[PDB]
Design an enzyme around this catalytic site. Sequence first.
Site, PDB file in Angstrom:
ATOM      1  N   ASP A   1      -3.783   5.639  12.131  1.00 21.41           N
ATOM      2  CA  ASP A   1      -3.394   4.463  11.352  1.00 21.41           C
ATOM      3  C   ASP A   1      -4.171   3.221  11.796  1.00 21.41           C
ATOM      4  OD1 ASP A   1      -2.177   3.106   9.354  1.00 21.41           O
ATOM      5  OD2 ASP A   1      -0.138   3.236  10.152  1.00 21.41           O
TER       6      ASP A   1
ATOM      7  N   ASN B   1      -7.494   1.497   5.081  1.00 23.60           N
ATOM      8  CA  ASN B   1      -7.022   2.811   5.487  1.00 23.60           C
ATOM      9  C   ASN B   1      -6.378   3.562   4.327  1.00 23.60           C
ATOM     10  OD1 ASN B   1      -4.475   1.647   5.149  1.00 23.60           O
ATOM     11  ND2 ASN B   1      -4.026   1.540   7.341  1.00 23.60           N
TER      12      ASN B   1
ATOM     13  N   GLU C   1       0.818  -1.223   0.000  1.00 25.47           N
ATOM     14  CA  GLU C   1       0.000   0.000   0.000  1.00 25.47           C
ATOM     15  C   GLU C   1       0.850   1.272   0.000  1.00 25.47           C
ATOM     16  OE1 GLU C   1      -2.640  -0.044   3.413  1.00 25.47           O
ATOM     17  OE2 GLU C   1      -0.971  -0.503   4.764  1.00 25.47           O
TER      18      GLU C   1
END
Lengths: 249, 249, 595, 595
Positions: free
Chosen positions: D303, D261, D177
């Site tokens: 996070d 996220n 990511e």
Amino acid sequence: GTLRVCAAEQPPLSMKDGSGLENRIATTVAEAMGRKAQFVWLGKPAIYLVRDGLEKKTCDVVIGLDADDPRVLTSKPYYRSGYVFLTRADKDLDIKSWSDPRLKEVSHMVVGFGTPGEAMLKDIGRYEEDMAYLYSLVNFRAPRNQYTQIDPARMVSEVATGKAEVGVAFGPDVARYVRDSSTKLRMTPVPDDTQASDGRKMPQSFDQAMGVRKDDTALKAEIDAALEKAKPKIEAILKEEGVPVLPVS
Amino acid sequence: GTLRVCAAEQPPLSMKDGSGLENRIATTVAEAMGRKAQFVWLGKPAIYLVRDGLEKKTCDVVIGLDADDPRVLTSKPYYRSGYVFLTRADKDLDIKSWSDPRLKEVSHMVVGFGTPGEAMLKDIGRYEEDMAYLYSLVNFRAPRNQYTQIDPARMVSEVATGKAEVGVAFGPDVARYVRDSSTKLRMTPVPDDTQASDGRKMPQSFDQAMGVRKDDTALKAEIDAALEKAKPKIEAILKEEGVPVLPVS
Amino acid sequence: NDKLVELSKSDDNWVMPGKNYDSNNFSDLKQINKGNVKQLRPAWTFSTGLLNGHEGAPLVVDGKMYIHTSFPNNTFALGLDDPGTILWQDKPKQNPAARAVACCDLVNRGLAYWPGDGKTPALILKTQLDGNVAALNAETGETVWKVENSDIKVGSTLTIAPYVVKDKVIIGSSGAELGVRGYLTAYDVKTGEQVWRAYATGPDKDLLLASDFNIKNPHYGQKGLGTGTWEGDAWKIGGGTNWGWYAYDPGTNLIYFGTGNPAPWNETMRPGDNKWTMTIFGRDADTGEAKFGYQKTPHDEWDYAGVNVMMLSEQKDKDGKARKLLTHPDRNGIVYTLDRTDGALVSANKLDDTVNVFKSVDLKTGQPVRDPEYGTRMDHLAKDICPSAMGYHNQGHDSYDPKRELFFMGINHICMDWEPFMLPYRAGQFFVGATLNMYPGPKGDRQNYEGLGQIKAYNAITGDYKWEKMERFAVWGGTMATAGDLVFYGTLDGYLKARDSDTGDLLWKFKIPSGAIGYPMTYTHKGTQYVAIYYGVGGWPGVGLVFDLADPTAGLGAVGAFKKLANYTQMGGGVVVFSLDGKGPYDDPNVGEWK
Amino acid sequence: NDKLVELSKSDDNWVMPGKNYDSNNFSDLKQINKGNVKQLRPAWTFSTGLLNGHEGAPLVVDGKMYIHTSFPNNTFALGLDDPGTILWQDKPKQNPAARAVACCDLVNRGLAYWPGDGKTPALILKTQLDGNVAALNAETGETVWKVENSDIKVGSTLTIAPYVVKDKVIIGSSGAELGVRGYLTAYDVKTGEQVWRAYATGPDKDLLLASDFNIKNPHYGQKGLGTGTWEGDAWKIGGGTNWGWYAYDPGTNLIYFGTGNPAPWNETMRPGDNKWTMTIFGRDADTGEAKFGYQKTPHDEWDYAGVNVMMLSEQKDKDGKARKLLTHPDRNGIVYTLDRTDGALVSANKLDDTVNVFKSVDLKTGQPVRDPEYGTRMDHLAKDICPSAMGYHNQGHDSYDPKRELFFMGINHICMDWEPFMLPYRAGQFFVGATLNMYPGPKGDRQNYEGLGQIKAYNAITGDYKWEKMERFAVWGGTMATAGDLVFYGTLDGYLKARDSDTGDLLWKFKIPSGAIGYPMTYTHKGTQYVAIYYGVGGWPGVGLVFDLADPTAGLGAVGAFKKLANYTQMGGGVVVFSLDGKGPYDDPNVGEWK
């Protein structure tokens, strides 16, 4: 036009990138005959090239074999070589023969496996003092089935670093590494009048010639015809590489 | 009477073997002062050299830091440097500024992390095309706690192979590698009048001065009195290393 | 020493390998018997964190269990009331080169325990692969002393387990044996100085023999044969390392062991008997002087190894006189029974009737009768040679039942081929070698490659076999015997099995995560009997599974013979404990919980 | 599918992760209950041969068991009559670079099963870390088709499990990511051709939205917000990958899941709401069009990751009308309960009363109420933020009881710190980072680092907790509830425990070789109930144990909070099966022996 040249991975004779002496010499001979060289690769080392490559009807010619070899038919030899000593230049260890007393006092020597040097080490009584070192140069893995040998680069490194004082090697396998070595080493040809304690002669020089299958006489004729045509190029390549070639006699 | 220097593993600046520019430039000044240099080794990279090395009362002086740095005292600077471009020869791709439209069409470029080059890539709208490439130059491991950066040799290798076309790098980090590269690479200094889209100025040249502790005024006197004694030697070493040097004020 | 015997009489302890100085692997507990053998269920399990072969058995002393591992030779201590918590662990940091030298062998064989006097605490003694011997505290895990024994540069690595006799620790040698001899060393257990060292091949000064060596059997060889049999100075690379087990007798104050095969593997290079190699020794415990030695296989050609287990017993001979005897199985298919006092040959027999490599063994002269058809060096294809290089008997620990006077053993069933070859090369160079094939014996199945093991009960004096049973794969690790009429053993398939002693009927079998190459142990904590066993496969039988080798010739034919092992098991490592009805420490769930 | 529903109604099968399209982990078997829970003992065990984390549960369909491992993603098939024999195995050969990119995480979720029509046979669907998706035959084990999905060069590696709906297989995306956004793909199960793709962030064409998207709740965000919330072209690096579970409803023909996220981790570089990241989605199975979407945490700063499990139920609301509901736990400490027909908000509550990151969630607007003291701001000491980055809930699969209307969950107890820092360097460079610490919560103790997890029973509508229990270490993997009034779960200490479903008293506990990070499963073969569970430790809790890390800051503080795990467990991997009184296939020892 194809040649179907046998090949196996072994430095510095044969590499994939084509920088070995085998590759240059095969390309020159193939160009002399007008064909294009085709490489048939076998993963196993050169020791298995003949028994698995030539009589299995896969590759047609082998580039390096001793003359008058009974297994396969041999062409005319194109160069002469032999075993050479290896000693550091600055150590002031002048050695010219195998009967010199100082060999019994050297801390360690490096030799190959199944070679005349090992036989003479047994003859003069030094195998017990160097067997552990010899089997430690490679990892302690020497099975009955597989073939194990010390890489020539390792030999040259051992002579250069000072862990071994006197080494015995074969010229074609070590000429490239001695040419490019940082420290200045020193070679010396082994005399052909080499005699053991029993008396049996131990030769130290050999011809080198190509090998073809028994039936292919026409290919032998073509190879013979091209040898004198390409001789100057082969001599120039050998001179450039640094192999000490002895006169043919 | 010995001098303690703060050193860390950071090629090609400081290495154990002492062949780096940092070690040589430290030894020359140490000999100029007549007092032998001692190398205090700290495992963490150079960015941690000051806070964990100078205020912890372990080593005395750091060898390379920017001029007028606020946290630690700076001595007299001794050479200039700056960011330079990196391309190939005879590609007809010459870049002399950061507004050349060809920069929007190249396949990829290599820059560091947290550097003016990264901000300039932000300005001209190219970060999205290259972020994956930059995070792939190193393995995809960039934790928040630790500090990660691309090795200087990796940038030169990537420019030489052909994966990236245009690179931006600091002089001293790549001066050794560029002149040893097989393919003839080309440098170019980056103009100091570089302006972003907003208008804020981005400097591209910096001074290099030694750094000492706050209270060591006598050691400062020794350092800035011995710098002019060995200045020809420092200049000769710097010219030999191949580092581009901009004129001083 | 003397405290260890009293600790051995108690049923709550397992102090040393073999549980005794007699190496019987016999327990007097009868809580678990044939009446209630079908109710055994596991109590608790523990995992190590390594993928290799786990050998030996754990030790239990004073309410604690000590667990040893393979490379890199970790150690754990556990409490029997709360097995979840680990009291202490030891994980050494070894030299990176140690793994490079040794690739096939990465195992270990056990630990040693010394009770200690009042001044010095009890000690756990261990050895490392790099060639270091260490002593640790039994309660804390700290290090008291550490010494270096072997040399990695020569090529010697340590796999053996230490032995504890009186106030001394005895350590042998092992490794690649390419260019080294073999020697035995004794150290003081308190501090670590060297007391005596003995060699296998060499002059009489290095052998360290006694004045009455072989006084009663003078035709076995007395003096000067360490160098006489060898031609020249070959004994400096002769070999003869010992890596088997030991036995000790307090009455005669002797330690009994055996030596390994000679080197190099080529028979032409070493002409002669090669004396004091592959021989049984009885040596003094204090001064180290040898009382008797007997050679088994003169001038070996099949690359065997006489490093098997040795047992002690007291029995009546054929005439009717009670004698103290020692029994030794061997890889060459011959089981020996000798007298411990002097060394007279009492019996010698064949494990199976399909040996065909030795016609018989002569009792009067002690020399075997060879069959030249099945011998090597003929320079042709020798076929149907049994046993193979692995031999009929493995490196396991067999068992003895005194009341029934029986020996319970696990015997391999494999046969071997042998084909020499020579290959020339370019410049006065050639390579000589031999290729081997391994296949199941006559009583199994050859097409499907199954039926490679047997389990037997034996009587030494008479020579009869009470019962014989077959197994799918080889039985590596050994057996245990119980006074409740039970014989316990593990299998490479991944089962733990129990058999009836008198008849041999199968009564109970359980499936464990992986194969076992160790032997089970039993104990009691609080009125309850527990049986514990290791699990984890490796070594020679599982070389192909471990190293992912598909070539049949690789591993000297081990891959070919054991090609079907991957269809029944995988790798792992740990320990499992069994008890009646699964009764264990955590019967009350509130024990061992937070707050 | 329609065949899978009928297969799931039977008690002999466990066909998909969650055992149902409702993701309940509920079994109607009552052979094991409170009366005879003390008699559970192991029946058999199996070892995989790897040392990493093992997640998920095995599948049992038509008398076979399918076992999947971690990297390099092996597969085994076993027969329930003779578990010793392995019917087939699949061991792939992957590119060497695959381990280099994603060495931090080497795990897998599970497998998928498709019954197959008359023409085509049944299929087992799996994914590999290199980025390939493969279909295999169930009976034999060959490969029918293989496709490439992700790219290693970008940095995307696969850990998820496929989902089988109708004649289609649905696959998400996962990886580093760093510089890529997430997407969802549907493939045909017979051939392998691509049907539809959907993106998380971007224009409306890439989102592939419907005409009546969020028609009932227009204030959640309707159109054009894929690029409006982001500044410039940041959405090309936004992220939003999903690696959680799925749910499916035949009546409404929808599949429910949630996204991850946003990236990068620095909240300063991505100003805005970052729409359609951390969003609950319900998409059509046939065409992929989205029907509604709901965002949980706008502009995440801590996070977190909203990739937890979805559950389905049918209950009465406070007014008194029957409604079909979906329940979703989240890492931030909020449990959401929505209507799975339109998307109306029904309930939102806090898992524990020690949540300080949020004060409350407004039902009328859906916007959480934030406490700025516990936020993340530069040049400040953000101290005692509960929860940590791990969060109260994680990747385990919780349980639901239809008769009692109760949810059984395992909740972490960890609280963290946060400190930013900037470090300058030589020539116009600087590094910006943050350091994190993790410690147990108020209900445990911080000196000894114990008390890091709890287990709870919850009611969705009213919001009460029936009982609450503590544990030594964090619960990780999930729970499984039965109709015999029992709740089963595994612990990182190496324990399997069963508790009562009414009061919560602990009734039975067993010690497995290593810790468990999966969830138990139950089935019946021939009038006998079996309970199976994996064992093996890895992931975030085991990072220090797996990789031998001793720095508290390493692993984002995971090593520090889990510094005492090495005193209770070690590494391993395998499966264990339990049954009443230990009854199993090998009750007759003669079954499965060579003959």
